[PDB]
Design a protein around this ligand. Sequence first.
Ligand SMILES: N[C@@H](CCP(=O)(O)O)C(=O)O
Ligand SMILES: [Mg+2]
Length: 295
Amino acid sequence: VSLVATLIANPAKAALAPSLGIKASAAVNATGLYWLADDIACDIPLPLGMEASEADASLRATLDGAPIDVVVQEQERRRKKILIADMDSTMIGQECIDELAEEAGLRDHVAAITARAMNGEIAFEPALRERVALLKGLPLSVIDKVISTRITLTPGGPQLVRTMRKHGAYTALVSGGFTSFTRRIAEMIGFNEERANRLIDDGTRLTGTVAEPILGREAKVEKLVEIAERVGLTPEDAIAVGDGANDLGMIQLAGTGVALHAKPAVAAQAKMRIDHGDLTALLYIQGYRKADFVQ
Ligand SMILES: N[C@@H](CCP(=O)(O)O)C(=O)O
Ligand SMILES: [Mg+2]
Protein backbone atom coordinates (compact mmCIF):
# COMPACT_ATOMS: atom_id res chain seq x y z
CA VAL A 1 0.00 0.00 0.00
CA SER A 2 3.17 2.11 0.28
CA LEU A 3 4.41 4.72 -2.18
CA VAL A 4 7.75 5.93 -3.51
CA ALA A 5 8.63 9.09 -5.39
CA THR A 6 11.63 9.23 -7.71
CA LEU A 7 13.43 12.38 -8.84
CA ILE A 8 15.37 12.14 -12.06
CA ALA A 9 17.75 14.45 -13.90
CA ASN A 10 19.40 14.14 -17.27
CA PRO A 11 22.97 12.83 -16.74
CA ALA A 12 24.15 15.54 -19.16
CA LYS A 13 22.60 18.19 -16.87
CA ALA A 14 22.82 16.42 -13.53
CA ALA A 15 21.28 19.01 -11.24
CA LEU A 16 19.86 16.82 -8.44
CA ALA A 17 22.37 17.94 -5.83
CA PRO A 18 22.51 16.33 -2.37
CA SER A 19 20.98 19.44 -0.73
CA LEU A 20 18.18 19.51 -3.31
CA GLY A 21 17.27 15.88 -2.61
CA ILE A 22 17.12 16.54 1.12
CA LYS A 23 14.99 19.65 0.60
CA ALA A 24 12.61 17.57 -1.51
CA SER A 25 12.40 14.73 1.00
CA ALA A 26 11.73 17.27 3.74
CA ALA A 27 8.91 18.70 1.62
CA VAL A 28 6.93 15.44 1.87
CA ASN A 29 7.82 14.49 5.46
CA ALA A 30 9.75 11.61 3.92
CA THR A 31 10.92 8.57 5.88
CA GLY A 32 14.32 8.36 4.15
CA LEU A 33 16.26 9.18 1.02
CA TYR A 34 18.16 6.72 -1.19
CA TRP A 35 20.47 7.69 -4.05
CA LEU A 36 20.26 5.57 -7.17
CA ALA A 37 22.80 7.76 -8.99
CA ASP A 38 24.69 10.73 -7.53
CA ASP A 39 23.33 14.07 -8.85
CA ILE A 40 20.92 12.16 -11.13
CA ALA A 41 18.25 10.12 -9.34
CA CYS A 42 17.00 9.41 -5.85
CA ASP A 43 14.13 7.47 -4.28
CA ILE A 44 11.94 9.13 -1.67
CA PRO A 45 9.69 6.74 0.29
CA LEU A 46 6.42 8.51 0.91
CA PRO A 47 5.12 8.39 4.50
CA LEU A 48 2.09 6.13 4.73
CA GLY A 49 -1.24 7.83 4.15
CA MET A 50 -0.26 10.49 1.59
CA GLU A 51 -2.16 10.54 -1.70
CA ALA A 52 0.24 10.46 -4.64
CA SER A 53 -1.17 13.67 -6.14
CA GLU A 54 -0.18 15.52 -2.96
CA ALA A 55 3.45 14.41 -3.18
CA ASP A 56 3.66 15.16 -6.90
CA ALA A 57 2.52 18.74 -6.34
CA SER A 58 4.74 19.19 -3.28
CA LEU A 59 7.83 17.86 -5.03
CA ARG A 60 7.21 19.82 -8.23
CA ALA A 61 6.82 23.04 -6.22
CA THR A 62 10.04 22.45 -4.26
CA LEU A 63 11.91 21.66 -7.48
CA ASP A 64 10.23 24.38 -9.54
CA GLY A 65 12.57 25.75 -12.16
CA ALA A 66 14.99 22.85 -11.85
CA PRO A 67 15.21 20.32 -14.75
CA ILE A 68 14.22 17.36 -12.59
CA ASP A 69 11.37 14.97 -13.35
CA VAL A 70 9.03 13.65 -10.66
CA VAL A 71 7.24 10.29 -10.72
CA VAL A 72 5.26 8.65 -7.93
CA GLN A 73 4.29 4.98 -7.83
CA GLU A 74 3.82 1.98 -5.56
CA GLN A 75 7.14 0.46 -4.57
CA GLU A 76 5.95 -3.11 -5.14
CA ARG A 77 6.17 -4.41 -8.70
CA ARG A 78 7.91 -1.28 -9.98
CA ARG A 79 10.63 -3.37 -11.60
CA LYS A 80 9.04 -4.70 -14.81
CA LYS A 81 9.82 -7.76 -16.92
CA ILE A 82 8.76 -6.46 -20.35
CA LEU A 83 9.97 -3.35 -22.17
CA ILE A 84 7.98 -2.15 -25.18
CA ALA A 85 9.43 0.99 -26.77
CA ASP A 86 8.59 3.18 -29.72
CA MET A 87 11.46 3.88 -32.17
CA ASP A 88 11.11 7.28 -33.87
CA SER A 89 12.04 10.21 -31.60
CA THR A 90 12.26 7.79 -28.67
CA MET A 91 15.16 5.34 -29.18
CA ILE A 92 16.52 7.32 -32.14
CA GLY A 93 16.75 11.06 -32.54
CA GLN A 94 14.95 11.26 -35.89
CA GLU A 95 11.72 10.42 -37.70
CA CYS A 96 12.65 7.77 -40.27
CA ILE A 97 9.83 8.96 -42.54
CA ASP A 98 10.94 12.61 -42.43
CA GLU A 99 14.52 11.56 -43.26
CA LEU A 100 13.32 9.51 -46.24
CA ALA A 101 11.18 12.44 -47.39
CA GLU A 102 14.31 14.60 -47.56
CA GLU A 103 15.57 12.32 -50.33
CA ALA A 104 12.42 13.21 -52.29
CA GLY A 105 13.02 16.89 -51.61
CA LEU A 106 9.94 17.03 -49.40
CA ARG A 107 11.29 17.01 -45.84
CA ASP A 108 9.35 20.02 -44.61
CA HIS A 109 6.03 19.06 -46.19
CA VAL A 110 6.20 15.54 -44.77
CA ALA A 111 7.58 16.66 -41.41
CA ALA A 112 4.58 18.93 -40.89
CA ILE A 113 2.26 15.96 -41.39
CA THR A 114 4.34 13.87 -38.97
CA ALA A 115 4.04 16.55 -36.28
CA ARG A 116 0.25 16.57 -36.63
CA ALA A 117 0.10 12.77 -36.53
CA MET A 118 2.31 12.51 -33.47
CA ASN A 119 0.27 15.22 -31.72
CA GLY A 120 -2.91 13.22 -32.47
CA GLU A 121 -4.52 15.75 -34.82
CA ILE A 122 -4.77 13.10 -37.59
CA ALA A 123 -5.15 9.34 -37.33
CA PHE A 124 -1.92 7.42 -37.81
CA GLU A 125 -2.94 5.26 -40.78
CA PRO A 126 -4.12 8.02 -43.21
CA ALA A 127 -1.12 10.14 -42.19
CA LEU A 128 1.29 7.28 -42.93
CA ARG A 129 -0.29 6.54 -46.32
CA GLU A 130 -0.16 10.21 -47.32
CA ARG A 131 3.51 10.56 -46.39
CA VAL A 132 4.67 7.24 -47.83
CA ALA A 133 2.87 8.01 -51.11
CA LEU A 134 5.35 10.86 -51.65
CA LEU A 135 8.27 8.41 -51.47
CA LYS A 136 7.13 6.68 -54.68
CA GLY A 137 10.04 5.89 -56.97
CA LEU A 138 12.84 6.34 -54.44
CA PRO A 139 15.59 3.76 -55.06
CA LEU A 140 15.91 1.05 -52.42
CA SER A 141 19.53 2.15 -51.90
CA VAL A 142 18.20 5.22 -50.08
CA ILE A 143 17.39 3.24 -46.93
CA ASP A 144 20.96 2.25 -46.01
CA LYS A 145 22.02 5.77 -46.99
CA VAL A 146 19.69 7.33 -44.43
CA ILE A 147 20.47 4.79 -41.71
CA SER A 148 24.22 5.08 -42.11
CA THR A 149 24.39 8.88 -42.25
CA ARG A 150 21.45 10.48 -40.43
CA ILE A 151 20.17 8.09 -37.71
CA THR A 152 21.56 8.42 -34.17
CA LEU A 153 20.70 6.54 -30.98
CA THR A 154 19.03 8.36 -28.10
CA PRO A 155 21.27 8.65 -25.00
CA GLY A 156 20.72 5.94 -22.42
CA GLY A 157 18.98 3.60 -24.92
CA PRO A 158 21.53 0.77 -25.00
CA GLN A 159 22.00 0.95 -21.23
CA LEU A 160 18.25 0.76 -20.62
CA VAL A 161 17.79 -2.26 -22.88
CA ARG A 162 20.97 -4.11 -21.87
CA THR A 163 20.40 -3.50 -18.16
CA MET A 164 16.82 -4.75 -18.36
CA ARG A 165 17.91 -7.84 -20.31
CA LYS A 166 20.66 -8.50 -17.76
CA HIS A 167 17.82 -8.70 -15.22
CA GLY A 168 15.82 -11.11 -17.36
CA ALA A 169 13.31 -8.74 -18.97
CA TYR A 170 11.99 -9.26 -22.50
CA THR A 171 12.53 -6.16 -24.68
CA ALA A 172 10.69 -5.21 -27.88
CA LEU A 173 11.03 -2.28 -30.31
CA VAL A 174 7.51 -1.71 -31.61
CA SER A 175 7.20 1.06 -34.18
CA GLY A 176 4.85 2.67 -36.66
CA GLY A 177 7.96 3.06 -38.83
CA PHE A 178 9.62 0.59 -41.15
CA THR A 179 11.16 -2.85 -40.69
CA SER A 180 14.10 -1.89 -42.90
CA PHE A 181 15.05 0.55 -40.10
CA THR A 182 13.84 -1.22 -36.94
CA ARG A 183 15.70 -4.44 -37.75
CA ARG A 184 19.05 -2.62 -37.82
CA ILE A 185 18.28 -0.25 -34.93
CA ALA A 186 16.96 -3.03 -32.70
CA GLU A 187 20.21 -4.99 -33.02
CA MET A 188 22.33 -1.87 -32.55
CA ILE A 189 20.57 -1.22 -29.25
CA GLY A 190 20.09 -4.87 -28.25
CA PHE A 191 16.33 -5.55 -28.21
CA ASN A 192 15.02 -9.11 -28.22
CA GLU A 193 12.54 -8.37 -31.00
CA GLU A 194 11.18 -5.63 -33.25
CA ARG A 195 7.86 -5.16 -35.08
CA ALA A 196 7.07 -2.36 -37.54
CA ASN A 197 5.30 -1.49 -40.77
CA ARG A 198 6.76 -2.49 -44.13
CA LEU A 199 7.47 -0.44 -47.23
CA ILE A 200 6.46 -2.13 -50.48
CA ASP A 201 9.00 -2.17 -53.32
CA ASP A 202 8.96 -3.49 -56.90
CA GLY A 203 12.44 -4.96 -56.46
CA THR A 204 14.27 -1.78 -57.43
CA ARG A 205 12.17 1.18 -56.17
CA LEU A 206 9.64 1.98 -53.46
CA THR A 207 6.08 1.72 -54.71
CA GLY A 208 4.96 4.46 -52.33
CA THR A 209 2.66 2.18 -50.35
CA VAL A 210 2.79 0.23 -47.11
CA ALA A 211 1.77 -3.37 -46.46
CA GLU A 212 -1.74 -3.58 -45.05
CA PRO A 213 -3.09 -3.85 -42.41
CA ILE A 214 -1.11 -0.82 -41.20
CA LEU A 215 0.21 -1.13 -37.66
CA GLY A 216 -1.05 1.89 -35.69
CA ARG A 217 -2.12 2.82 -32.19
CA GLU A 218 -4.19 -0.31 -31.56
CA ALA A 219 -1.53 -2.57 -33.09
CA LYS A 220 0.86 -1.47 -30.33
CA VAL A 221 -1.71 -2.46 -27.72
CA GLU A 222 -2.18 -5.81 -29.44
CA LYS A 223 1.56 -6.45 -29.64
CA LEU A 224 1.92 -5.68 -25.91
CA VAL A 225 -0.90 -8.15 -25.20
CA GLU A 226 0.70 -10.77 -27.49
CA ILE A 227 4.10 -10.38 -25.83
CA ALA A 228 2.82 -10.66 -22.27
CA GLU A 229 0.79 -13.76 -23.09
CA ARG A 230 3.68 -15.42 -24.92
CA VAL A 231 6.10 -14.90 -22.00
CA GLY A 232 3.51 -15.90 -19.42
CA LEU A 233 2.90 -12.50 -17.82
CA THR A 234 0.32 -9.69 -18.12
CA PRO A 235 0.64 -6.12 -19.46
CA GLU A 236 0.89 -5.03 -15.81
CA ASP A 237 4.38 -6.56 -15.90
CA ALA A 238 5.46 -4.16 -18.67
CA ILE A 239 6.95 -0.71 -18.93
CA ALA A 240 6.01 1.06 -22.19
CA VAL A 241 7.54 4.28 -23.49
CA GLY A 242 6.95 6.62 -26.39
CA ASP A 243 6.52 10.21 -27.48
CA GLY A 244 3.57 10.12 -29.87
CA ALA A 245 -0.19 9.80 -29.89
CA ASN A 246 0.08 6.35 -31.48
CA ASP A 247 1.85 5.18 -28.25
CA LEU A 248 -0.89 6.21 -25.82
CA GLY A 249 -2.66 2.85 -26.14
CA MET A 250 0.33 0.85 -24.96
CA ILE A 251 1.34 3.58 -22.47
CA GLN A 252 -2.11 3.43 -20.87
CA LEU A 253 -2.32 -0.38 -20.87
CA ALA A 254 1.15 -1.12 -19.50
CA GLY A 255 1.70 -1.26 -15.75
CA THR A 256 4.13 1.65 -16.13
CA GLY A 257 3.55 3.91 -19.15
CA VAL A 258 6.00 6.74 -19.79
CA ALA A 259 5.46 9.75 -22.03
CA LEU A 260 9.08 10.61 -22.87
CA HIS A 261 9.69 14.13 -24.19
CA ALA A 262 6.23 13.79 -25.62
CA LYS A 263 4.21 16.02 -27.91
CA PRO A 264 2.15 18.57 -25.90
CA ALA A 265 -1.27 16.91 -26.22
CA VAL A 266 0.35 13.51 -25.63
CA ALA A 267 2.06 14.45 -22.36
CA ALA A 268 -1.28 15.90 -21.21
CA GLN A 269 -2.82 12.40 -21.40
CA ALA A 270 -0.07 10.39 -19.70
CA LYS A 271 -0.03 9.48 -16.02
CA MET A 272 3.78 9.41 -15.99
CA ARG A 273 5.98 11.86 -17.90
CA ILE A 274 9.73 12.32 -18.27
CA ASP A 275 10.65 15.72 -19.74
CA HIS A 276 14.30 16.16 -18.63
CA GLY A 277 15.89 12.72 -18.22
CA ASP A 278 17.17 10.48 -20.98
CA LEU A 279 16.32 6.78 -21.40
CA THR A 280 18.22 5.89 -18.21
CA ALA A 281 15.25 7.56 -16.50
CA LEU A 282 13.30 4.35 -17.12
CA LEU A 283 15.94 2.42 -15.16
CA TYR A 284 15.54 4.76 -12.17
CA ILE A 285 11.77 4.56 -12.50
CA GLN A 286 12.19 0.82 -12.01
CA GLY A 287 14.38 1.24 -8.93
CA TYR A 288 17.74 0.32 -10.43
CA ARG A 289 20.90 1.79 -8.90
CA LYS A 290 23.74 2.87 -11.16
CA ALA A 291 25.71 -0.07 -9.72
CA ASP A 292 23.20 -2.44 -11.35
CA PHE A 293 23.74 -0.99 -14.84
CA VAL A 294 25.46 -2.75 -17.72
CA GLN A 295 28.36 -0.31 -18.11
N1 LIG B 1 6.57 8.70 -35.82
C1 LIG B 1 6.41 7.94 -37.06
C2 LIG B 1 5.99 6.51 -36.73
C3 LIG B 1 7.18 5.65 -36.37
P1 LIG B 1 7.24 5.35 -34.53
O1 LIG B 1 5.91 4.72 -34.14
O2 LIG B 1 7.37 6.67 -33.79
O3 LIG B 1 8.46 4.47 -34.24
C4 LIG B 1 5.30 8.53 -37.93
O4 LIG B 1 4.70 9.58 -37.62
O5 LIG B 1 4.97 7.94 -38.99
MG1 LIG C 1 7.64 8.07 -31.91
